[PDB]
Symmetry: D2
Subunit: 422 residues, 4 copies
Amino acid sequence: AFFQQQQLPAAMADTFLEHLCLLDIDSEPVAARSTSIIATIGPASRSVERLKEMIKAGMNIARLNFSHGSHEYHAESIANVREAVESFAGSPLSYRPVAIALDTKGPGSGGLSEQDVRDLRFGVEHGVDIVFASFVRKASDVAAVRAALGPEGHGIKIISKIENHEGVKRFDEILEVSDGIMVARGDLGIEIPAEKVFLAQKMMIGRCNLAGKPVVCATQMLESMITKPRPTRAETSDVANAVLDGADCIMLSGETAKGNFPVEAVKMQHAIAREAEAAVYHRQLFEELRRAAPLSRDPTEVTAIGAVEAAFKCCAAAIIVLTTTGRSAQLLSRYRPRAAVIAVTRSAQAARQVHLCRGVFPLLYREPPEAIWADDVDRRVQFGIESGKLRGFLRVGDLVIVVTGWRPGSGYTNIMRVLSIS
Amino acid sequence: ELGTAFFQQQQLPAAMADTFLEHLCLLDIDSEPVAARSTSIIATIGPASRSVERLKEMIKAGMNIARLNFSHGSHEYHAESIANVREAVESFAGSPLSYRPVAIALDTKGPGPGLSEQDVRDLRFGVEHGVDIVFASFVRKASDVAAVRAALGPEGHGIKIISKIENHEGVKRFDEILEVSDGIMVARGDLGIEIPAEKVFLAQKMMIGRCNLAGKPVVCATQMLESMITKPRPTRAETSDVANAVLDGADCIMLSGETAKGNFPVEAVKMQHAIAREAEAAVYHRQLFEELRRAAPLSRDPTEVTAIGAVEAAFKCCAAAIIVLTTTGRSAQLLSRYRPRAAVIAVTRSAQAARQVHLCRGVFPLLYREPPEAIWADDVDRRVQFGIESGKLRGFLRVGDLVIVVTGWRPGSGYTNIMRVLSIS
Amino acid sequence: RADVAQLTQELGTAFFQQQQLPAAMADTFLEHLCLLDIDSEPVAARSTSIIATIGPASRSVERLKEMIKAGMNIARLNFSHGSHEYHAESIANVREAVESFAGSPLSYRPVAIALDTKGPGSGPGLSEQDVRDLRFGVEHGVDIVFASFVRKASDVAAVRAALGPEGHGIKIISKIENHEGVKRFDEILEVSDGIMVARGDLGIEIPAEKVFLAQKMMIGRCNLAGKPVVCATQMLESMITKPRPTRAETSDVANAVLDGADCIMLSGETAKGNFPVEAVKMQHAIAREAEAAVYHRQLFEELRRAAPLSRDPTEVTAIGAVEAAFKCCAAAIIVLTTTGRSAQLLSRYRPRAAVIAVTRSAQAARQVHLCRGVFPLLYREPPEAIWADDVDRRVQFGIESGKLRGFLRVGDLVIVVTGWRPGSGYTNIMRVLSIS
Amino acid sequence: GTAFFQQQQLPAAMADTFLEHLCLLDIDSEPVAARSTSIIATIGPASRSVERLKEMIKAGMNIARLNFSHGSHEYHAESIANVREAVESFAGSPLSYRPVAIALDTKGPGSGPGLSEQDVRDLRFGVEHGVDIVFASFVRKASDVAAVRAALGPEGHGIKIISKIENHEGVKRFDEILEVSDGIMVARGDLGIEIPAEKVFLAQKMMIGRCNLAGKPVVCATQMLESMITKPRPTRAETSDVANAVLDGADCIMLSGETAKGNFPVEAVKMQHAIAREAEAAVYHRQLFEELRRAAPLSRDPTEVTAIGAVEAAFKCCAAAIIVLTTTGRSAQLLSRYRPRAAVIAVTRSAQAARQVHLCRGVFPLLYREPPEAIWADDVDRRVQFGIESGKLRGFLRVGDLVIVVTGWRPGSGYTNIMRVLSIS
Ligand SMILES: O=S(=O)(NCc1ccc(Cc2ccc(O)c(O)c2)cc1)c1ccccc1
Ligand SMILES: O=S(=O)(NCc1ccc(Cc2ccc(O)c(O)c2)cc1)c1ccccc1
Ligand SMILES: O=P(O)(O)OC[C@H]1O[C@](O)(COP(=O)(O)O)[C@@H](O)[C@@H]1O
Ligand SMILES: O=P(O)(O)OC[C@H]1O[C@](O)(COP(=O)(O)O)[C@@H](O)[C@@H]1O
Ligand SMILES: O=P(O)(O)OC[C@H]1O[C@](O)(COP(=O)(O)O)[C@@H](O)[C@@H]1O
Ligand SMILES: O=P(O)(O)OC[C@H]1O[C@](O)(COP(=O)(O)O)[C@@H](O)[C@@H]1O
Ligand SMILES: O=C([O-])C(=O)[O-]
Ligand SMILES: O=C([O-])C(=O)[O-]
Ligand SMILES: O=C([O-])C(=O)[O-]
Ligand SMILES: O=C([O-])C(=O)[O-]
Ligand SMILES: [K+]
Ligand SMILES: [K+]
Ligand SMILES: [K+]
Ligand SMILES: [K+]
Ligand SMILES: [Mg+2]
Ligand SMILES: [Mg+2]
Ligand SMILES: [Mg+2]
Ligand SMILES: [Mg+2]
């Protein structure tokens, strides 16, 4: 029964053609949904009660579109998101962190506009986790956004939106200085021929996967759901193909901001992403990512590849990793393990931000500390196991890979352990 | 010899990549497509696309197959649509650069326990009106195909039966259906109501993969550019869907309400043409050819053996075309199954085979009507030169190019066994 | 170039020109061959063990010390000739030469003692002389038995029974020397600790032109099973009388290593020849060149694809450790082992990094020479009060001994493999450590 | 049949990995194909008798090597006459006649910087006596090859120059030497004294790999069966060395003292024949063909394009043979470079080309002696039928086998462009 589920016959295929031939509509997905969902907050999704339903449906990142609405409007949206998120904090083993992303208005006819400087300052003051920087055309645009965030915004992730020909042509220099990328297909589809957008999307996703940096696919993914309860056949195909392409996140704009079915749009992206993740041909994907990732003398990078290899060898249900900044979890995610990456962190901001990385499930640790550091580490690993059992990731008898470091503080991950559950 | 400009076009840097990941990383929006569009476009005929003048614009835009939906309209209405298609097609007979065959496909209303009475009558209408293809609705098992075949009667055994897979049973019994069918249509409209909407992409990719393995045509259909029924431009999901159906391996892509009743039928055809050309250049031929070769069983059939040798030879020299002489279309179909980048120019005396080979990706039919030469070898050479001169006129070939030529050792269908390398003079 | 660019700037272009590294980075086996370079010098310690047959040319204590220095790892006693008294004196001379280097535990070289049986002769199974010779082996503490003319699984069960309850730790290496042994190979390998491709008799029992097929098949199946395989007989035959071997002989040694042999053997070359020390030096020089020429990119990929999924934590840790070692160009993998098993499971994935096996068992230290790339370090300190401290001291002993021997250098990365509790069978941890 | 797929290591040939290919090698799986690696035997006192030479031709000797380091011109002229007399004693049965090449191995430069005066005289003797090949000793750079070519004069333009790599400089300047040479010899005797003995296998494997990539013949030489100079059977290292030279990709294997002066010249040839047949069946063609195709550059030469198409077609149908008509041997050499499992039966009228194609693995030369037919197409057909009749008599072909036939569009060398699938009747 285990080997009939989650497209495992198609996963064992010797060629990509045979993998396609073995895909089975009756093979049910079992793993938790790996690709994060970004939902744009607006009149249709602003209330606390509506936001609770969207969190339950699968929303991981709330997007604030600063092209419309005042600072007062956006501050109320942020407060409503935080109220809905904290309503589930009473059960720490099941609590789900939700990131808040600020999407800038952009440069308009201008570099960094004066409104963007004020909006970025608002973001830092309100503790946003991510900035989706509009119309990034070159590396100096990213440096300007970074400078506008100041010393208090050092920890905010900058995701550069590629929306025109120049952004595509200067992609490598933009990715180098960015934390990640958004394929902003709306403007991209007007700036370059509509029939070429799929080439830009596939190229950018491939380069972000190679760099190990998050990539978001955005705009018109389930467009018809703004007025209709069910999407078109092209829309479900688009969501599935963005996941198969290698996107870390998928996005909803008008579908959740102003449409009549915001919760249903989130549920639809969740249902498609789960099916598409099981249909990923891991045999070729892992081989290619492993071959292309450069040789490294960084112990976190070395431990990450060893852990992902070990996970595939034993069909590990999960890789439990301790992380301060999210970096150790991101380096595991870049190798696209089938095993869920359960990231145990004390940082509420890192817990929200790791939603940008495919297959990272953040757990915010709030248990009393242990006097002995080695005992504190072990208690965090047991917390990952207990949350994993409650959420359906793990069962007694499963094997897990545990990734830790040799001393406290960020940057010292160097250990991988094989553990039997219970 | 060819220049650096040649190797920058048609996604050639991405084509030379050693891995699929590197192939994706090398895709370039500035690398322009050069080859002729190989995925056929099926447009549904209706009130928005029935007039002779509108049909001429749709042929110019790229329509290769006209679909008649027998779920609506009388026999008289469909006979007038067929006459209008034929009138629009024959209006280009004066210019060899513009004349193109257009297939006519009858899409049945569907089943009741067996073949419905209306389907028996509609299939008989198809034979009487000389249709080329039947898109058989709601095929659930091999006996449904046998019933459609029997209803094509004494005169219509040459009509191609494309089975529409629209429900759970058709998906589960796919192998037995494909075995007795000429091809398959992934009919996503009903399929998306019969099975969970989130599973349709799995059924589409599986059916396309199995048809590619079997060397039989597969059509991707329904809601590909849906928003274009009322809007002049499609959504980002719609252009992505068309490109991904071509990258999946679909031989044909289809338009339904977009051309039958929408406000922009010509624009919908133009959009499918533009996307398909871009997506065909983005196909990773290096892995695709290797996998089709490895999966295809060994064969002692000379047509099959010649086809793989010709496709291998075409890749070796960057051949502009493979010119094949065919009476039934079979030798061209066996070349098409290996997905050459070279266009397959199929020269035939059969008007029906010329229309039907539009079902096979990358087959460009040329209908030959000259009186037959007394010496067979001279008649073969005249048809090969007709393919070369048509290719020159249409932009496929230039003097100095290399072409692969596929013929047989004697007249009649079934004897293809020869592959030649010719320098265009 | 992007996959090695940062490491090339850090370690230098000279590092990536040595040990056939340009040929190692090739995308195809054909390109790997085209890039093999006679100017690319080997750097790694020799990983294929050398078995030398003891005889009149190599029996003295002084001669044995030179053979240990030249690279002999396993001493073979051929029980087809010589009395029990003769073989007991050979064993005592080997042990005296081995213990003459015990003064420095960090450098000392364990040497295994292997008993090669006379065989069944015209009989159907275990002969009476073999029963007596196997009892002599147990009484004299031999580490390995090379069982002659093994034809079926019941032959190895008979050898096992003759070793008695006190010889349970002795490794049984089945010699495949005839058609039946080749045809029943799978059942023989299943119950054996390893195999010897005994080409002398095999080349008379089957057509001489088919021996290479049997050798390549048996080496491939042993590599797939993760069990040691020895290539034997006439590898450097002309060196019995000449100081230099023929072109076919150097080729044969290199190809046995490239095929995947864990051990290579010398018979008359060391037992009776005029150049026993030179024959050992020649096998050492060829094996180091051939080990660097192994196409690890395809070999590692194929060993992972063919090896079934495992729920054994030692097996899971071993593949993770070998993958980590390749990622950082690790100098060594340091492993703690009681029986040798954790080191054997690392060895089956054929890492380029040396596997430094730290053990308290003198017998396991001798026996791990059967596994390619395992360098045994015998730890003699009494146990620390706290088990975690005792584990740490053994890891540090491997590091310090490694540095003092040129295996490790300051700045190198090392992979360390340990377990969660004392006793054999609990290896489950892999650590990345920087050498300071 | 199942018996067919159990022979010639076919279970090991179908393996998905090289490791699984090794695990499936079977000592009971008998070789079926004809031996494709040529055997060069050095002529000396043990192999000069016309009667002894007839036995060596029957045992499998394809090339007779004359070592000009020993013996006078008078001695070598008698060797040549004895070889020719033994070879021509079988000319009375044209369907079984085996051509045998004559190769002149030069003394070398000695302590000098380039072409010695004795080599100039020996090379002139070679041209005057019609030798087919020159094995040029101690080639260190491209100018050494040009000097050998100049010494052959205007009448020796058709002689093949095989450069012997015997020292460090030859290995380091390998690429420039291969570029101007017809092929290479890995001369392990001197190479093993000029560089450390333990590094010779690296130079051998590298040079064989680069020659396979370039599509040029490579010879493995010296001490392959050394102990057979005095003993009836070789050592285990010697049989392994022969098998590994074939597995490495050598086109030819050589015997020196084993045939020139030893007591078992015929047995040494029989032993190389037996080992080479076993080793050729153990070649992992799945990976080898894939890598040769991937590495071989794109080509606009029709002979090269036809060759890859023909080899691909041969693998698809398990063709018993590829029958090629050739004037210079070039069309057969281009087929050989893709290492088909099918035997390349090369039909030629050139006695010299028939002798020289023995340098290319898997090429079986057939010398055609009939004068040209009046109709060129009939002359082509008669030569193809001669290849079939020779193949049937020699055991290469049987009724029911498929063969690939490679011809050109006009008489004269350089116009091969046709591949055809033929059933043996
Ligand atoms: O491992 S992957 O999932 N590769 C998917 C993939 C797609 C197309 C083809 C080429 C082909 C196209 C269509 C075919 O039907 C067919 O047989 C072959 C081969 C492989 C992967 C994904 C993302 C990044 C790296 C790697
Ligand atoms: O297709 S071939 O015959 N390749 C042979 C080959 C040998 C070793 C390995 C590396 C390895 C892998 C697995 C092993 O078991 C093992 O002993 C060594 C991989 C491939 C071929 C020959 C020549 C040129 C191109 C191609
Ligand atoms: O992923 P990051 O940010 O590098 O954090 C990993 C760090 O987490 C740990 O596992 C635990 O550290 P803390 O006890 O400081 O939380 C460290 O050993 C390791 O360096
Ligand atoms: O593709 P099909 O229908 O098998 O037809 C291929 C046939 O066409 C030819 O090339 C030409 O045949 P005709 O002269 O009869 O048209 C034959 O030699 C070959 O058998
Ligand atoms: O390779 P083996 O024989 O399984 O030994 C590995 C064992 O060695 C250890 O690392 C140390 O164990 P000891 O303290 O008993 O020597 C164990 O944790 C582990 O189980
Ligand atoms: O291999 P080569 O030397 O190019 O010879 C191939 C030539 O042989 C032929 O098949 C037959 O030519 P001939 O009739 O002159 O012998 C030509 O058509 C072709 O060009
Ligand atoms: O800004 C965006 O999100 C877009 O243009 O798609
Ligand atoms: O009939 C169709 O085309 C469908 O249901 O998609
Ligand atoms: O016994 C042996 O070692 C042999 O036969 O090779
Ligand atoms: O000259 C030769 O043949 C050699 O040195 O091997
Ligand atoms: K915005
Ligand atoms: K219909
Ligand atoms: K013995
Ligand atoms: K000479
Ligand atoms: Mg935008
Ligand atoms: Mg329908
Ligand atoms: Mg023996
Ligand atoms: Mg020499």
